[PDB]
Paper text:
[name] receptors are a family of trimeric cation channels that are activated by extracellular ATP. They play particularly important roles in sensory neurons where their activation is critical for gustatory and nociceptive responses, visceral reflexes and sensory hypersensitization. [name] homomeric receptors activate and desensitize on the millisecond timescale upon binding ATP but unbind ATP and recover from desensitization on the timescale of minutes. Although free-ATP is an agonist in laboratory conditions, [name] receptors are activated primarily by Ca2+-ATP and [name]+-ATP under physiological conditions because ATP released from cells at micromolar concentrations would largely be in complex with Ca2+ and [name]+, both of which are present in millimolar concentrations in extracellular physiological solutions.
We began by crystalizing the hP2X3 MFCslow construct in solutions containing ATP with either [name]+ or Ca2+. We solved X-ray structures of the receptor with [name]+-ATP or Ca2+-ATP bound at resolutions of 3.8 Å and 3.3 Å, respectively. The pores appear to be in an open-like conformation in both structures, similar to that observed in the structure of hP2X3 bound to free-ATP. Importantly, we observed strong residual electron densities around the ATP binding site in these structures. That the [name]+-ATP complex observed in our structures adopts a rare configuration suggests that interactions between the receptor and divalent ions have a dominant effect in determining the structure and stability of the complex. In the presence of ATP and [name]+, the simulation data (obtained with a conventional algorithm) is highly consistent with our crystal structures, showing stable close-range interactions between [name]+ and both the ATP γ-phosphate and D158.
Author numbering:
A (entry chain C), B (entry chain A), C (entry chain B): 7 to 363
Write the structure that this text describes.
């Protein structure tokens, strides 16, 4: 039988419970309108899956080890990705060749060939088993490998000029849920701007060219100490865009920070360095290499974003849930009514029809 | 007191509101079955945290600078990860040596030694302060650095053969939530297929071998212009799988796009190139280098996914929400019944027991 | 009129339905405290958008091709990012120069110059169009390019010492929603620890030093086969932290797996290799190169996390959803009471006030 059910309802008219319920209903409606709808923007579909593309180019010259260094000297790797390192400090060990030689660290002090056993395996090459004089004051164990051994201890200068190098970022973003593409290079960017512009979070926040010193500062870092220890700085590019607004309002927000924080809270591993070698070989077949322990700043360009565009489906579902939530005040209103007018028994009686068996 | 409450209910038996409520209930149930259950598949848990592993290897040979280039020549970096560049154009500066030489851009045109001060610091090398004859017609400032300077301007030809190179992708995906592993190499892939296979959206859509010229076509790009300007193309691999279906139905979808979108929309930065150097030294200790400004296409293999497998918790909660939602039609049915039969007062009286105090 | 509505309610007092509904409600309340609050911890806000930074350094020395190899030889690329390879096997092609020579894979077999045409376009260099003796028993097609060609086929030994190398991971994590930073190097880590510590999932789970052999074992892989074929292992770093608990309890969880899983279930591409060349050039300007096919284990340092901390808003909304969901049992209790107490007719009459017109 096609029958429509619906509850039998009391309709109290006390001025007290009347205004207090109307106030609870007003607060519920305003909370859902201002928060769930305006702020949290539940009326639009959200896309967090951003497509990004970063192309970088470093520019500048520096003085180091009686050489003039250009980008190709101090940037590694060079293909211009969202991660690159700018070498600021280098410990060079020139012209290593395969042979036999003693270690240079005081950690390998010896007086007899009997001590040079399978105990200290890492570092350099393989122990030859002999104990050989490294200097007039020190004897260390002999190893086969790349000779002469590097000295890790003597500090070398840093390339101050790197502070004035320039990082150019080319970022292409696409939100697929809305098929919306934009880049951090607006159409009104000119060649003249590019040759001279200067990024600043306030004075020029759209200039694709970032001064390394500016970035180091923005992360609160001291160029001298950082270029001495090496480290990683993160350049974050945020694309929080409400596409219901104007197209030209989808705009990139720059952030700057230091990513390798653990290094400062450690006296044992304070920075970031890596070792690599330039390989040459003579007219004779023998090979030799220049071994460089490089200290520098690694840069990660981190591009995130989320875009929301209005659709009717989330709007409908949110309005349905809003109407279904306006009712929740009935329980609190029940408590107030049934326990705060002295004649509470009247309402308990009006509402409750007991049964027993 | 162990008491079970339940409300007193009117049960109208009007054929009109009876059928309109029964139809509203059918619409809610059908929307829940077709959309919530079938389409949005709320009966299964979704895992988006896919683990992916990409290994690439390029193949091909080409003529450039009267040389035959193989992979180790035009592929960079070489370790073959989900990112690589295939160089299509090279502006080469052979045999750079650290020394003194004049700049070559008209941007450094001068007549007096006073113009070359510490003002235009970046680029090339460091100004020595003199103004030196660069050619019979032009005078430019001198620099200390890698000599002679690179000339940026004369366009060089492109490696046409790059169009016919082959990109082999090896992709492994794993869903931990369901402990399901699968890869883009189907078990029915043979050595003979590999020896001849062919990626194509229709004729062979599983061949791990993709023609570069094909990929360029698939993003809607003209190979000539792309090899001239450089750019970034994204090869996307999708693993959208309904694990309730068959194991061999979890299949990867290839899509092709160009990621450096701003490049065509820019008159200032139209492509993707970078500069690097081959490092040599004579039998003499003297160092010299070959400088390459490389233009090529970057490939990032982008693997995303989400898999759904049935579990009892999502079905239980969806069915609970359905039963809690069947009641929603009553507000509409209340308004229609209580305000559109002239004797609405009968139902207001049957339903509403007013109160006053 | 500021009026408060509320429904009229039956209040059954049967002992049977009293305890059966109270038990349903007890099960609902206990499920909500134990599951939604204790287990799923809905009383706290979650952030999964973790910011992370990894810096790695490998150490060890090994014998290969009768040379001692250190970090600068076998780690690639070397900048110590979250991805690096420890080359374990090399197929070397010494002293290639630009020229004419026949192919070395049997795939190029010929007897007549008519077979080496523009038919088999890919591979090696450019077919010269002639057919030349590659061996006394075999003839292959001649190509223009780097000569003599590499042989892919002769099996080479592996670098056994690679098993005893050490990988040092330095991970910094940042939860921005709670602005909480920490690193996997606890402040009570000493130099002595670093010099002698030993990672083990049980005995010392915080020593940043991982033996490559240990990593191979934990991912359930045999060093010999991995090192012969090459592959990808994933080192995942997890930060599941309940900030409500102790601060020093935010601890990284290490897991080990092999990522290139398809390699083992496939007869086509069983491992991981790539090719690169050491570039030289003679006293004459002419270039020659040493070509290396590199087999190794790739390492991905994979850092995920989610942090949850108590907030008043999630607790409030969960308690609200709990109180609004306790009502759901009334439908089952309606069914039971109205159809399983013999006096069901009593309750049907007490509850339902029929109407007809
Ligand atoms: N680090 C940097 N500092 C300042 N300007 C830069 C930097 N990198 C690029 N630019 C400028 O941005 C513009 C576009 O960059 P892009 O490198 O794509 O062009 P390009 O002609 O290859 O540049 P160049 O010839 O200067 O290497 C160029 O005019 C270049 O001068
Ligand atoms: N692979 C490894 N195995 C064992 N210990 C390591 C390893 N890598 C680094 N360490 C230790 O941790 C510290 C980290 O040093 P870091 O790489 O930051 O600069 P470094 O002091 O120049 O390193 P090193 O002296 O080892 O070349 C080192 O002093 C070293 O003792
Ligand atoms: N870009 C490519 N184009 C065509 N075939 C390829 C490509 N990359 C790999 N292959 C083939 O796919 C298979 C998987 O390659 P893999 O590198 O694992 O084997 P390989 O023997 O080292 O290959 P190669 O013959 O290049 O040495 C090989 O048989 C190789 O011939
Ligand atoms: O709430 C977001 C919503 O977006 C999409 O829904 C589509 C639907 O899939 C299409 O068939 C279309 O007809 O209706 C909606 C229009 O936006 C997603 O498919 C869906 O998963 C999601 O709920
Ligand atoms: O193939 C074995 C598979 O059977 C079941 O899968 C069902 C699935 O649950 C349904 O949604 C249906 O439409 O498709 C399948 C039947 O072909 C279960 O998943 C399980 O028993 C098993 O994995
Ligand atoms: O999920 C967390 C939630 O945090 C933020 O909400 C804040 C709000 O911004 C503050 O004004 C604070 O007083 O109230 C909330 C605390 O939870 C974000 O606004 C919001 O997007 C985010 O969901
Ligand atoms: C940066 O450039 C300015 C002007 O060219 C100069 O005063 C300053 O010393 C430079 N910075 C460094 C670290 O050399
Ligand atoms: C380019 O136009 C945008 C549009 O609002 C504006 O923000 C920007 O200032 C313009 N560019 C310059 C260099 O002023
Ligand atoms: C190769 O010749 C060079 C001289 O060019 C010499 O120094 C070197 O020792 C020779 N190689 C060997 C293994 O002796
Ligand atoms: C690419 O291959 C086609 C046939 O596949 C051939 O006709 C064409 O000439 C090749 N392109 C180049 C630049 O050699
Ligand atoms: C391999 O299997 C897939 C589906 O598993 C099928 O589409 C494809 O055609 C098969 N390939 C061959 C060569 O049979
Ligand atoms: C590695 O060291 C262990 C113990 O230190 C030893 O059992 C093994 O022989 C060593 N292997 C190599 C290749 O050095
Ligand atoms: C350092 O502290 C951690 C946690 O507080 C502890 O697990 C570890 O045992 C401590 N280190 C040593 C060497 O005891
Ligand atoms: C370059 O010189 C080398 C010997 O140093 C010789 O083998 C080669 O044929 C020469 N090539 C040219 C083009 O001069
Ligand atoms: Mg040291
Ligand atoms: Mg230029
Ligand atoms: Mg081969």
């Amino acid at each position: 039988f096609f029958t429509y059910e619906t509850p039998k309802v009391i309709v109290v008219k006390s001025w007290t419970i009347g205004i207090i319920n109307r106030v609870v209903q007003l607060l519920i409606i305003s909370y859902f309108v201002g928060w769930v709808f305006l702020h949290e923007k539940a009326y639009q579909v959200r896309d967090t899956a951003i497509e990004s593309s970063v192309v970088t180019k470093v520019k500048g010259s520096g003085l180091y080890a009686n050489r003039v260094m250009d980008v190709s000297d101090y940037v590694t790797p060079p293909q211009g990705t969202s991660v690159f390192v700018i070498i600021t400090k280098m410990i060079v060990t020139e012209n290593q060749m395969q042979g036999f030689c003693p270690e240079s660290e005081e950690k390998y002090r010896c007086v007899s060939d009997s001590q040079c056993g399978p105990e200290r395996l890492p570092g350099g090459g393989i122990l030859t088993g002999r104990c050989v004089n490294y200097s007039s004051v020190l004897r260390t164990c002999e190893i086969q490998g790349w000779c002469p051994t590097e000295v890790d201890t003597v500090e070398t200068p840093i390339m101050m000029e790197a502070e004035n190098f320039t990082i150019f970022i080319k970022n292409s973003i696409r939100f697929p849920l809305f098929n919306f593409e934009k880049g951090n290079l607006l159409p009104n960017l000119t060649a003249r701007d590019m040759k001279t512009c200067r990024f600043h979070p306030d004075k020029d926040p759209f200039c694709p060219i970032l001064r390394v010193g500016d970035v180091v500062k923005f992360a609160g870092q001291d160029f001298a100490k950082l270029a001495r220890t090496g480290g990683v700085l993160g350049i974050k590019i945020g694309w929080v865009c409400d596409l219901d607004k104007a197209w030209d309002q989808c705009i990139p927000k720059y952030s700057f920070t230091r990513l390798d924080s653990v290094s400062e809270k450690s006296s044992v591993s304070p920075g970031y360095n890596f070792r690599f070698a330039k390989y040459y070989k003579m007219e004779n077949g023998s090979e030799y290499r220049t071994l460089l322990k490089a200290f520098g700043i690694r840069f990660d360009v981190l591009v995130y974003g989320n875009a929301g565009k209005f659709n009717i489906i989330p709007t409908i579902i949110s309005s349905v849930a809003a109407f279904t939530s306006v009712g929740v005040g009935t329980v609190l209103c029940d408590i107030i009514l049934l326990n705060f007018l002295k004649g509470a028994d009247q309402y308990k009686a009006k509402k409750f029809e007991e049964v027993n068996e």
